[PDB]
Enzyme design. Structure first.
Site, mmCIF file in Angstrom:
data_model
loop_
_atom_site.group_PDB
_atom_site.id
_atom_site.type_symbol
_atom_site.label_atom_id
_atom_site.label_comp_id
_atom_site.label_asym_id
_atom_site.label_seq_id
_atom_site.Cartn_x
_atom_site.Cartn_y
_atom_site.Cartn_z
ATOM 1 N N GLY E 52 -13.313 11.944 -7.501
ATOM 2 C CA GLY E 52 -12.097 11.765 -8.324
ATOM 3 C C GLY E 52 -11.277 11.069 -7.219
ATOM 4 O O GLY E 52 -10.315 11.586 -6.642
ATOM 5 N N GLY E 53 -11.676 9.819 -7.037
ATOM 6 C CA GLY E 53 -11.468 8.945 -5.971
ATOM 7 C C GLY E 53 -10.302 9.040 -5.169
ATOM 8 O O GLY E 53 -10.440 8.721 -4.001
ATOM 9 N N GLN E 54 -9.177 9.409 -5.786
ATOM 10 C CA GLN E 54 -7.866 9.609 -5.231
ATOM 11 C C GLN E 54 -7.555 9.106 -3.847
ATOM 12 O O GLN E 54 -8.287 9.266 -2.900
ATOM 13 N N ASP E 55 -6.485 8.329 -3.709
ATOM 14 C CA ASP E 55 -6.385 7.409 -2.630
ATOM 15 C C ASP E 55 -6.626 7.778 -1.244
ATOM 16 O O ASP E 55 -7.321 7.041 -0.589
#
Lengths: 272, 604, 139, 123, 159
Positions: E52-55
């Site tokens: 939930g790739g999130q920066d």
């Protein structure tokens, strides 16, 4: 008996495809040993570890879980990252037993960022509410560090305290108060009411009696007026107990040169 | 903690086993379906029947009002759907959807839909705009469909209960649930949703006497509750307070706090079992079908606790059940009478006790707040507890420096700075106590006047009221007493002499104290002293001030409300709702005064 | 109330192989050790009802071959503290069903570590009821 | 030119005066002008000179909430004094004396002219 | 096989994942505190990393390396926005170079009614034909259908 440098390379071997739960468990023990006697620590070494530890997580194995906690727990004031953990963390949280959960909070608490906090608060609400005290207890201690860090927002939570304020486990009964005091101790007043709060009240996991004593005196001490009606109530009670220490506790303090009421003290004393 | 609380036996009917209830919000009408087979719609307010319909004479299981639609939906277990336009009760349409005993309808409100569950082990969706199309059929059954509820929150997604004990929650893209979960160890009678959008709980019902809470987002049984006295016919979410309503197969009410989760109370209208429930979405009035009848109860306060400093901060606490943690508001800016305004943001507080009174110190300052039955007084800026104790009833010594109390017995003790004032110590029959400048003890359907230092029965007047507001300097005082109302003079000197002479009447009080100036026959929504001017609300929603022999309506209000505060300087009134938008209308006090003075011959 | 300033697990031979310094105030690992030298050594092979060093409370269980220690401040209650001192002492004992030795430690190193964390976690005593515990854990 | 004179001088470092004199006697009692540990806490001391009286105000703007700024002291009188000025403690942060003053000249040969109660409002 | 399923939090990758994996889904937010999951398919033993790739982590998403060999790259098909340009190219190229030792199979998600702008334009833009390169598949899906899923895996379970 054994040495660190080699080990430091070797620990990652568990991280190497290697299946043999035991082997790694042991190796972990050593690391901890190096550590236990005394060990340098640092980032690079950590970071590499960060990738290393991380993959290893199809383990079901409960005990396996244990091991992890400990290690992580090791990283706290020198902690590195949290987001990964979130999922993991979540996993303890949803995680069936109770157990998993307590360790995680415990590392977390010296180390963390405001921000996430909000979220994790909810979890706290839950902990706060659960019947098997333990975890709840686990929750509490963390907070303290969080108090280290800060804990003020923790304050906001007073309410929860109340819902909690109903207690029936002795030790537990004890734990709540400790916090509380801190809280109100920034505040005379409430406390005065608190006293009243306990006043209706006797105490479960005693221990509680004792902190309260120090406390109960501590307002009075400065001349929180009336020894007479309040104090005394406490005292007969105090006196009465087979929590001989409690009796003592009162006794020791009242060290009064003229004998405030010299007489009684002598019985207590006889008894002493 | 106490039932010092609103419970009203709002409306009653004794009847049969009224199975079903459905609410008309849009006009608080209620629809009920009976085990008779006759269904009736009532305006409860005056216990009046809006319409009744014999839809079938077989027990009629399901009902809806379709408000948007302006029509009322009905179904009986002739397996047909009969429609009325409720706009008479003119019956629009009929057709056979589900061919078996039709248990429940859940509706999409946003979107033009009627969802139905029926015992045929079928859920059908029908589209009204398509003119009752069976748009889609939802299936994945194992038994009769006992209940449907729409998660209206996500209208769009909904949940289903069956007594084969399982719950399917569905997605449109699942004319089947997304999943089924294995809820009951009995059967899942019912499924219900958690009022807030924020978090998510369902309660489901069983008579097994165990409750499980579930969080959907995680997807857990949050927890499972026990304690019970008898098969819970039903248990419900209080949507107003955090409490748990439990209901039984004998029609037992037990309440557990949905926060204490401690049995707060048991009530018996042993009208036998909880057949239905329906709740005010405004979260305050609810009705349930019982066998012996049904009862509806009214359960609310009309306000938060707040009191306003004339700088301009109405500090309230809470919102509605939110923590007290939120007080403040000095604002910063100006705008038009009709138009609306902005607030500041900086909470203080996070009390525990749940109040229902706020009253300022006479200089705003010290508020004494009561809640849970005890009084916390705050040092406010301080955010300090100014003080606490348990009440029963109260008067600040108006002066701003003493206070009185009515002990939950009924016999007076008063404290000034925690010193009892016994110089004054009647303890006669009362009703309520009133402070102010002049002491009231309201007793024996009378209001009796007392000194401030010793008691004296100064006067007794005819009856009892409900409330007193005193002019500011006391002088002319305003007492609210149902419809009717009076304005008075209190004349000192007489007393001084009389007292000196001593020999008096006090049964009546002494007829040589007060005079009855004039009375307005009055209904008050809220009311005000501007000095001795009675500026008042009426609950007829005109804001009027009785001025000059005149009562004038400055303006008439939506429906009536609460008087924000007129900060005189500004000469404006801040008007207050209870929903935290403030409106202001300026007057200019002087104008009133100008009038006051001149009549008085202070023309110049 | 954070009682364990530190906790030490000690030889007869006056050494410490476990210590978790609940809080440090004089730094280093080192500095702890010097202290050992005085203190342990001196005490070595013999215990007290009470012992003090300078307004601090000195606590601990022994074995013939092994030493257990807890430090707190002597400024407070013997009994509880003892109770605790034991609580640990027993728990482990019971747990072990054996007298720890030098042997015990090598015999299983893990258990110590594991043990160490559960009751006290840097300083305060979270965990207890040793039997309970004992049962409570096993994993 | 009492103990209080020393105070006349202590007061003297300021120069916004509108008369003073030499202090005659000082206060028989300093008054806390804000009661016990208030949002702001004041104890006040009053000083008499042969010509003027200065009330110099001693204090701990209490709350750490606040610092009070734009501070001046109103006094409003019943039994005479000619009212020259009300003093502003430019800024007052938490737990801290700062000084604000209020000044009067004392009429002496009038029947009713130096005992007075003055009404205070903090701005 | 460490096969990395990539995309953001909020994608609803996760939804897919457990839909497949467990049969059943979970929220349209891909993980915050990761997935490592194991799946046997065709009785072959697989590790799924779901991001939930999130920066911040995204930046660090490289974060690990060893034993890398396969990509599910979940990209949302209908994503009209975050998909191409600098970001897309950068990610792709970087990844490619770094682990030229693993096939890149990109997954295009919630295709529903496709709310893209041309299947053709994009594939090209990604230089899908820059191919002369590692086993590739460009693959369409709307999650609910799972418009291409089993092949991805299947074709994959090819040796």
């Amino acid at each position: 008996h054994l040495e660190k440098s080699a080990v430091l390379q070797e620990a990652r071997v568990f991280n190497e495809t290697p299946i043999n739960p035991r082997k790694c468990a042991h190796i972990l023990t050593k690391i901890l040993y190096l550590i236990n006697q005394g060990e340098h620590l640092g980032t690079t070494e950590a970071t590499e570890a960060f990738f290393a530890m991380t993959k290893l997580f199809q383990s079901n194995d409960p005990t396996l879980r244990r091991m992890c906690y400990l290690t992580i727990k090791e990283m706290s004031c020198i902690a590195e990252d949290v987001i990964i953990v979130t999922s993991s963390l979540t996993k303890d949280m949803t995680g069936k037993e109770d157990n998993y959960r307590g360790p995680a909070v415990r590392a977390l608490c010296q180390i963390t960022d405001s921000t996430m906090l909000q979220a994790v608060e909810r979890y706290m609400k839950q902990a706060i509410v659960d019947k098997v005290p333990s975890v709840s207890s686990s929750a509490l201690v963390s907070s303290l560090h969080l108090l280290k860090c800060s804990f003020d927002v923790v304050k906001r939570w007073v309410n929860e305290a109340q819902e909690a304020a109903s207690s029936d486990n002795i030790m537990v009964q004890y734990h709540a108060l400790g916090l509380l005091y801190h809280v109100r101790k920034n505040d005379r007043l409430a406390v005065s009411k608190m006293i009243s709060k306990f006043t209706r009240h006797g105490l479960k996991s005693p221990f509680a009696y004792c902190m309260m004593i120090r406390v109960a005196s501590k307002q009075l001490e400065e001349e929180d007026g009336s020894r007479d009606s309040p104090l005394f109530d406490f005292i007969e009670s105090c006196l009465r107990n087979k929590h001989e220490m409690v009796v003592y506790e009162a006794a020791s303090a009242i060290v009064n040169l003229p004998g405030c009421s010299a007489k009684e003290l002598a019985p207590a004393v006889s008894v002493l | 903690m106490p039932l010092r609380l609103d419970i009203k036996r709002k409306l009653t009917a004794r009847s049969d086993r009224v199975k079903s209830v459905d609410l008309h919000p849009t006009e608080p009408w209620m629809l009920a379906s009976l085990y008779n087979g006759s269904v009736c719609v009532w305006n409860h307010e005056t216990q009046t029947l809006v319409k009744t319909f014999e839809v079938c004479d077989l027990p009629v299981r399901a009902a809806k009002f379709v408000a948007r639609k302006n029509w009322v939906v009905t179904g009986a277990d002739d397996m047909q759907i009969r429609v009325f336009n409720y706009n008479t009760l003119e019956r629009v349409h009929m057709f056979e959807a589900h061919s078996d005993y039709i248990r429940c309808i859940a509706v999409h409100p946003t979107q033009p839909f009627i969802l139905t569950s029926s015992d045929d082990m079928l859920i059908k969706l029908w589209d009204w705009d398509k003119k009752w199309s069976c748009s889609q059929v939802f299936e994945g059954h194992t038994h009769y469909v006992m209940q449907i509820v729409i998660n209206p929150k996500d209208n769009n997604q909904f949940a289903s209960a069956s007594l084969d004990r399982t719950i399917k929650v569905w997605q449109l893209g699942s004319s089947s649930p997304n999943f089924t979960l294995e809820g009951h160890e009995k059967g899942v009678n019912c499924i219900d949703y958690y009022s807030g959008g924020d978090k998510p709980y369902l309660i489901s019902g069983a008579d097994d006497r165990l409750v499980k809470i579930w969080d959907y987002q995680n997807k857990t049984c949050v927890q499972t509750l026990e304690g019970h006295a008898q098969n819970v016919s039903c248990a419900s979410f209080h949507p107003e307070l955090p409490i748990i309503i439990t209901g039984s197969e004998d029609g037992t009410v037990r309440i557990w706090h949905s926060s204490t989760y401690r049995l707060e109370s048991t009530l018996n209208y042993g009208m036998e079992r909880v057949w239905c429930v329906a709740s005010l979405r405004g979260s305050n009035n609810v009705a349930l079908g019982y066998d012996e009848g049904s009862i509806i109860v009214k359960l609310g306060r009309e306000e938060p606790a707040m009191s306003m400093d004339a700088n301009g901060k109405i500090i309230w606490a809470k919102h509605s059940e939110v923590q007290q943690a939120n007080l403040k508001a000095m604002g910063d800016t100006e705008i038009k009478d009709g138009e609306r305004l902005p607030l500041a943001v900086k909470d203080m507080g996070s009390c525990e006790i749940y109040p229902q009174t706020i009253q300022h110190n006479p200089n705003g300052r010290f508020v004494v707040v009561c809640g849970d039955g005890e009084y916390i007084i705050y040092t406010a800026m301080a955010l300090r507890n100014k003080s606490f104790g348990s009440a029963q009833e109260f008067a600040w010594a108006h002066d701003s420096s003493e206070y009185a109390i009515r002990e939950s017995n009924s016999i007076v003790k008063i404290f000034k700075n925690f010193k009892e004032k016994k110089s004054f110590k009647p303890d006669f029959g009362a009703e309520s106590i009133y402070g102010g400048f002049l002491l009231g003890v309201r007793s024996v359907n009378g209001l009796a006047f007392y000194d401030w230092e010793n008691t004296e029965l100064i006067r007794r007047i005819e009856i009892q009221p409900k409330h007193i507001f005193w002019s500011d300097s006391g002088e002319l005082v305003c007492i609210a007493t149902e419809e009717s109302f009076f304005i008075l003079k209190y004349l000192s000197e007489k007393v001084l002499a009389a007292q000196e002479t001593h020999e008096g009447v006090t049964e009546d009080g002494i007829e040589d104290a007060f005079e009855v100036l004039g009375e307005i026959q009055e209904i008050v929504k809220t009311g005000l002293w501007v000095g001795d001017c009675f500026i008042y609300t009426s609950s007829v929603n005109r804001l009027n001030y009785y001025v000059g022999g005149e009562i004038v309506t400055i303006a008439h209000l939506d429906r009536t409300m609460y008087l924000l505060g007129y900060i005189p300087k500004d000469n404006r009134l801040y008007l207050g709702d209870k929903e935290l938008n403030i409106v202001s209308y300026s007057l200019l006090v002087s104008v009133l005064e100008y009038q006051t003075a001149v009549m008085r011959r202070d023309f110049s | 109330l954070y009682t364990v300033k530190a906790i030490l697990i000690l030889d007869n031979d006056g050494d410490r192989l476990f210590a978790k310094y609940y809080d440090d105030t004089y730094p280093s690992v080192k500095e702890q050790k010097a202290f050992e030298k005085n203190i342990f050594n001196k005490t070595h092979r013999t215990d007290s009802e009470i012992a003090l060093l300078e307004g601090l409370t000195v606590v601990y269980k022994s074995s013939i071959d092994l030493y257990f220690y807890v430090i707190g401040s002597s400024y407070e209650n013997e009994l509880m503290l003892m109770a605790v001192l034991n609580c640990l002492f027993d728990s482990l004992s019971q747990m072990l069903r054996k007298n720890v030795e030098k042997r015990a430690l090598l015999e299983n190193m893990e258990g110590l570590f594991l043990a160490v964390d559960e009751i006290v976690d840097g300083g305060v005593i979270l965990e207890s009821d040793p039997q309970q515990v004992v049962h409570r854990v096993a994993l | 030119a009492t103990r209080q004179e020393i105070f006349q001088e202590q007061l003297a470092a300021v120069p916004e005066f509108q008369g003073l004199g030499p202090l005659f006697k000082s206060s028989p009692e300093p008054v806390a002008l804000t009661e016990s540990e208030t949002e702001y806490v004041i104890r006040c001391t009053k000083h008499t000179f042969s010509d003027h009286l200065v009330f110099q105000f001693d204090c701990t703007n209490t709350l750490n909430d606040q610092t009070l700024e734009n501070v001046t002291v109103q006094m409003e009188p019943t039994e005479a004094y000619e009212v020259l000025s009300y003093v502003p403690a430019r800024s007052l942060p938490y737990n801290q004396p700062g000084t604000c003053y209020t000044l009067v000249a004392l009429p002496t040969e009038d029947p009713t002219a130096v005992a007075c109660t003055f009404s205070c409002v903090m701005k | 096989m460490r096969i990395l399923m990539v995309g953001l939090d909020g994608a609803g990758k996760t939804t897919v994942l457990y839909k497949l994996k467990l049969g059943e889904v979970i929220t349209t937010i891909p993980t915050i505190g990761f997935n490592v999951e194991t799946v046997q398919y065709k009785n072959i033993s697989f590790t799924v990393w779901d991001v939930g790739g999130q920066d911040r982590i995204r930046s660090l998403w490289r974060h690990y390396y060893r034993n890398t060999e396969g990509v599910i790259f979940v990209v949302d098909s209908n994503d009209r926005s975050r998909i191409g340009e600098a970001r897309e190219v950068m990610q792709r190229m970087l990844n490619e170079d770094e682990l030229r030792n693993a096939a890149w199979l990109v997954f295009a998600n919630k295709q529903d009614l496709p709310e893209a702008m041309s299947a053709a334009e994009i594939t090209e833009k990604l230089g899908l034909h820059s191919i002369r390169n590692r086993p590739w598949f460009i693959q369409a899906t709307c999650a609910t259908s799972g418009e291409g899923l089993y092949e991805g895996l299947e074709w994959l379970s090819n040796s």
